[PDB]
Design a binder for these strands. Structure first.
Ligand SMILES: Nc1ncnc2c1ncn2[C@@H]1O[C@H](COP(=O)(O)OP(=O)(O)O)[C@@H](O)[C@H]1O
Ligand SMILES: Nc1ncnc2c1ncn2[C@@H]1O[C@H](COP(=O)(O)OP(=O)(O)O)[C@@H](O)[C@H]1O
Lengths: 626, 466
DNA sequence: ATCGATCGTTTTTTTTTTTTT
DNA sequence: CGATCGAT
């Protein structure tokens, strides 16, 4: 006998039926529905979840209407047409459900209800009048993440005689006042101030419709959304996310000089719930705290360390399927396990980081771009740019106007976001001299000090290389070394630590093996966990955990060999127009050494690292004996 | 009234530090004692000391601050009254410190207001002094105009009803810029923390304001520690805020303004750290509290006499800054003379006479001629280094502009040019183009240089060696 | 003092040519 | 949509 004016609902019906539905609940939505499954809970998921959450005391539930199909859909339909009149009754059912859970619990920190799952409406293009107070859910791509704004419901007041210092809030848009606030005799007029009063946060962002569910060959006409307190910046830009809301129409002000009103109501959706969709396949981010591993994984990690096979195992686990001449992947792996931390908080002097710098160069045949497009899907700080993707200022100082401030600002860069990281890079011999005289600065000092008319900066920037440089040629010219083939100077070419050379495999034969095997790889569209045991994440923490708790130290092992052999290692003074041996080599040798002691986790020095270092050298230092 | 507890609190805080505050001594009376003569009205207060004596008014403080804030000024006046024969000219600037918690641009809500929190960032696109006569005198027109009241609110309103008479209540008197209450601030912007550099979103920027004593001591390239005085911002007009609108429709018995407020932020404390050097009257780690020409300029004479007396300290000091280095022993003794002073005569109006000297390094490759100087940026003050090709000839010059931002042509600084009494050395003097080269051909000797093609009476000057 | 009838009320744009280094 | 202004 009671219902809202323009409705046919009643609140006790909805609350009571939802309460009975949760009581008629053994997790039946997947224990009766997915009866082949059996969650081992012959109790409601809901009182189970109030236990799971009040034992956790981290509030703010979520719902889905697939639970709410099996019950009488009168609740479902009258939630569809009157969701602003049926939603919070679910929260009231939750409020009594606390009492079902615990009488004296935290019955003041309040719970959301975030239903979904009727169906996709269709997509944004195709809408109607009637779908104005109903339930909608599409998705696509994101534009932005914009700034947040308060919003009042009340003011603060004042007085002069006896300090009638009071407030009164808003209903939604209509307020009252005496000639005072808390008026008695009207000793003054009304004093209103606007700060010490009630506010609410919210924020609006724009959203597209762009899966391949396209009006094909049409630009996606995009939508808009508000936000509310517990859903504010729930997502950062460049994501695809589901939406749950109720259509919300609004007039526009004709003119503006007067109060006339225009015919075209504009429409948007309010907010109930969204579905942030995560896709991080590669080796995850670097918070440090939210990544700590258990001891059971340490068992397997030190198990991996217990292999002398480990020297080749992870290098063998670099490729997904590529089985040709991985002899460098050990040289890769010293940067996989990305370098040692020889700190210089010790003397304040000379600040020699264990700088690790290696590049791959060769012919087009090698999959340097594609290998390392996949390795972009490996590196934690995965970047992928190259010659002619961005200028020097295309790497730094993205400076221009900002209508948010209504002013221009000094603004952003590229490398200082990628500290310690990598950018897979190709086509090195493509840039102006403006760039590539920056790289001398960083590769040789790992620094930056900047001077413009606006901000002037001495920042910090530092990281390791990967790159896929190329010559000015199509094939490396036989009998003309990369000493000149790729386009660089006389001993600056010599300056690099060592670029493990690449070139086409000069043997016709081996094509067929992998032209067949790794096409069959596609033909089956799955792999096998063969002797190449591809670890899901058991490889990935030996990567991750072995950046932090490790500190290579030198007692007597991996130094003294060339500290003897430098006699002939610096008989190199002779030569016409050549490039030779220098006393920066051993710096790289120590760095390599502590790197290879990182694998095997030898807190004290590894000595074998020298031997693979000498191997690393003289396999690719006799490429120009000429 | 609410904050009378805060009144009595800082009252008896005064009354305690009216006695000793710290070991028979007080840390905030002698700052106030230096205040007493000029009466400048700035005194930082330790936030720890609220928890020491007032017993956790921090949580009595750090939420209802914005409303409580003004009462601290009355408290300040009550402090200065007790021992000084006092007039109410006294005021209250504060530059708070001794605060632990350090939050950033992300934990922002309606719930963050009236705090004292300390925050950093960057400094960009600064903006100038722009005064404010916040107050004055204003009432009806005839005679009854003596109005030093509370009319200084941000939202300003000449219209006042009356004080003594029944007179005009919209017709105002004229203005007072003579004997009334005024003050100053500026306005600049700040980018996201470089200690907090996540992915995705932009560097969300905050608005920022500074009181009197804070002023012209912010600067590009610097991180800070603010107050936490997030605001209700007395804004005037904005678009896109199409929420519900309200206003007081008074009692029925037998002006309008659209309401959409925006955000900014305000602050009343700074420790511009990572930008602080101090000359010689600062007491360092190693000192000798003695008498001297100045405070600590050489009050370690007790040793510096010894460091100025040996015939061995020449070679010892030649060896007291190359512990990690070995090469020849001629630059190891000559290069310091570049950092060491020159002539410094006291002489005629003939022409500028110079103190500094040119200095060079040449050597074969891989000799650590760089590592001589890689440290020198970390070593000396004023004397920060990079390369010459580390920028353009917007190193010597500024970045040459040909678009309209303020007056369409701006070359008024550089990168060599801001090394006043420090050296900003460079590498690779052989392959650099012959532009800054011929600039240096006289800019080192005749340290008084000009340009054309965009000159605001171009007269610039080098200052140091190379 | 009160009400009502008097008085007077207006805002919208983006882009092309020659110039200088 | 606002203030002026006249009388009741
Ligand atoms: N082991 C391999 N696995 C997969 N693809 C390979 C392999 N070796 C060569 N390729 C193929 O060789 C091509 C290499 O070209 P690419 O490296 O991208 O040119 P560039 O050398 O200029 O970067 C790729 O298209 C890739 O498919
Ligand atoms: N006496 C020395 N003390 C310390 N380091 C030295 C010494 N002699 C040579 N070195 C090392 O030799 C390297 C020299 O390289 P550097 O001279 O900077 O290259 P470039 O010749 O391009 O300037 C430095 O890394 C430095 O550590």
């Amino acid at each position: 006998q009671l219902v809202v004016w323009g409705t046919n609902v009643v609140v006790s019906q909805c609350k009571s039926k939802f309460k009975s539905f949760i009581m008629r609940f053994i997790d039946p939505s997947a224990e009766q529905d997915e009866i082949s499954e059996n969650i081992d809970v012959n109790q409601p998921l809901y009182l189970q979840k109030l236990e799971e959450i009040h034992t956790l005391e981290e509030p703010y539930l979520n719902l889905n209407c697939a639970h709410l199909k099996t019950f009488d859909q009168d609740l479902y339909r009258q939630l569809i047409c009157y969701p602003q009149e049926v939603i919070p009754g679910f929260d009231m059912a939750i409020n009594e459900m606390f009492f079902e859970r615990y009488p004296a619990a935290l019955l003041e920190h309040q719970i959301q209800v975030r239903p979904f799952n009727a169906d996709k409406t269709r997509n944004m293009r195709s809408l109607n009048p009637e779908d104005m107070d109903q339930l909608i859910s599409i998705s696509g791509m994101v534009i932005r993440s914009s700034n947040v704004i308060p919003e009042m419901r009340e003011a603060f007041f004042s007085c002069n005689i006896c300090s009638f210092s009071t407030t009164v809030e808003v209903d939604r848009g209509r307020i009252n006042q005496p000639t005072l606030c808390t008026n008695c005799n009207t000793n003054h007029c009304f004093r209103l101030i606007h700060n010490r009063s009630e506010f609410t946060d919210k924020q609006l962002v724009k959203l597209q419709e762009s899966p391949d569910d396209m009006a094909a060959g049409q630009t996606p006409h995009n939508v808009l959304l508000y936000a509310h307190n517990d859903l504010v910046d729930k997502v950062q830009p460049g994501d695809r996310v589901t939406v749950t809301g109720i259509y919300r129409a609004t007039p526009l002000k004709t003119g503006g000089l007067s109060s006339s009103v225009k015919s075209v109501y504009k429409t948007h959706v309010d907010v109930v719930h969204f579905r942030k969709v995560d896709n991080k396949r590669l080796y995850e981010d670097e918070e440090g705290k939210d990544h700590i591993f258990p001891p059971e994984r340490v068992e397997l990690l030190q198990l991996l360390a217990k292999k002398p096979d480990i020297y080749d195992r992870l290098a063998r686990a670099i490729a997904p399927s590529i089985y040709e001449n991985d002899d460098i992947k050990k040289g890769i792996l010293l940067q996989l396990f990305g370098g040692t931390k020889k700190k210089h908080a010790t003397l304040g002097r000379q600040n020699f980081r264990s700088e690790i710098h290696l590049l791959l160069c060769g012919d087009p045949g090698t999959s340097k771009s594609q290998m390392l497009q996949y390795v972009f899907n490996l590196v934690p700080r995965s970047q992928y740019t190259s010659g002619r993707g961005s200028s020097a200022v295309g790497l730094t100082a993205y400076v221009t106007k900002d209508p948010e401030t209504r002013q221009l600002v000094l603004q952003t860069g590229a490398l200082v976001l990628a500290d310690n990281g990598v950018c897979c890079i190709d086509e090195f011999d493509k840039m102006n001299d403006s760039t590539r005289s920056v790289l001398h600065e960083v590769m040789e000092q790992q620094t930056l000090s900047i001077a413009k008319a606006g901000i002037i900066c001495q920042l910090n920037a530092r990281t390791s290389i990967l790159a896929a440089a190329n010559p000015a040629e199509s094939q490396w010219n036989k009998r003309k070394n990369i000493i000149d083939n790729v386009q660089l100077p006389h001993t600056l070419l010599s300056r690099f630590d060592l670029i493990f050379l690449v070139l086409d495999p000069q043997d016709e034969i081996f094509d067929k093996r992998l032209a067949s095997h790794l096409v069959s790889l596609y033909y089956v569209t799955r792999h096998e966990e063969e002797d190449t045991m591809f670890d899901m994440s058991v490889l990935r923490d030996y990567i991750a955990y072995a950046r932090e708790h490790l500190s290579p130290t030198l007692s007597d092992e991996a130094q003294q060999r060339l500290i003897q052999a430098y006699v002939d290692m610096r008989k190199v003074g002779a030569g016409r127009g050549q490039i030779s041996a220098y006393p920066r080599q051993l710096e790289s040798l120590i760095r390599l050494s502590e790197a290879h002691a990182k694998v095997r986790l030898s807190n004290q020095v590894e000595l074998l690292d020298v031997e693979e270092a000498w191997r690393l050298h003289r396999e690719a230092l006799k490429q120009s004996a000429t | 009234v609410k904050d009378e507890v805060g009144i009595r609190a800082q009252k008896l805080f005064q009354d305690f530090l009216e006695e000793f505050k710290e070991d028979g001594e007080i840390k905030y009376t002698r700052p106030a004692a230096s205040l007493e003569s000029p009466d400048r009205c700035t005194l930082e207060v330790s936030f720890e000391d609220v928890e020491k004596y007032d017993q956790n008014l921090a949580t009595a403080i750090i939420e209802e601050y914005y409303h409580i804030y003004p009462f601290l000024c009355q408290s300040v006046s009550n402090y200065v009254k007790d021992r000084i024969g006092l007039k109410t000219q006294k005021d209250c600037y504060v530059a708070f410190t001794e605060v632990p918690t350090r939050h950033k641009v992300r934990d922002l809500t309606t719930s963050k207001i009236g705090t004292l929190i300390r925050i950093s960032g960057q400094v960009v696109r600064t903006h100038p002094v722009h005064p404010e006569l916040v107050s004055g005198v204003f009432m009806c027109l005839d005679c009854q105009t003596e109005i030093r009241n509370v009319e200084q609110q941000f939202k300003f309103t000449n219209p006042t009803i009356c004080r003594n008479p029944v007179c005009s209540n919209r017709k105002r008197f004229m203005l007072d810029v003579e004997k009334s209450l005024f003050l100053d601030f500026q306005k600049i912007r700040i980018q996201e923390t470089q200690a907090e550099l996540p992915r995705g979103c932009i560097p969300r920027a905050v608005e920022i304001i500074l009181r009197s004593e804070l002023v012209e001591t912010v600067q590009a390239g610097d991180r800070y520690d603010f107050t936490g005085t997030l605001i209700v911002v007395p804004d005037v007009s904005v678009l896109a805020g199409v929420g519900t609108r309200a206003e007081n429709s008074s009692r029925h018995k037998p002006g309008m303004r659209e309401l959409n407020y925006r955000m900014a932020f305000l602050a009343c404390s700074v420790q511009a750290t990572t930008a602080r050097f101090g000359g010689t009257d600062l007491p360092m780690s190693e000192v000798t509290a003695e008498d001297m020409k100045k405070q600590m300029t050489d009050a370690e004479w007790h040793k510096i006499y010894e460091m100025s007396k040996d015939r061995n300290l020449y070679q010892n000091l030649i060896s007291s800054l190359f512990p990690s280095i070995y090469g020849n022993d001629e630059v190891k003794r000559g290069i310091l003379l570049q950092q060491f002073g020159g002539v410094a005569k006291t002489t005629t109006e003939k022409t500028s006479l110079r103190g500094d000297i040119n200095v060079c390094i040449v050597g074969d490759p891989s000799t650590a001629k760089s590592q001589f100087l890689k440290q020198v940026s970390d070593f000396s003050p004023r004397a920060i280094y990079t390369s010459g090709k580390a920028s353009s000839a917007a190193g010597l010059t500024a970045a040459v502009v040909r678009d309209e931002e303020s007056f369409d042509f701006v070359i008024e600084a550089g990168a060599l040019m801001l090394a006043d009494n420090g050296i900003c050395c460079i590498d690779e003097f052989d392959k650099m183009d012959q532009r800054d080269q011929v600039a240096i051909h006289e800019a080192m000797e005749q340290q008084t240089i000009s340009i054309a093609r965009a000159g605001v009476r171009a007269t610039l000057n080098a200052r140091t060696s190379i």
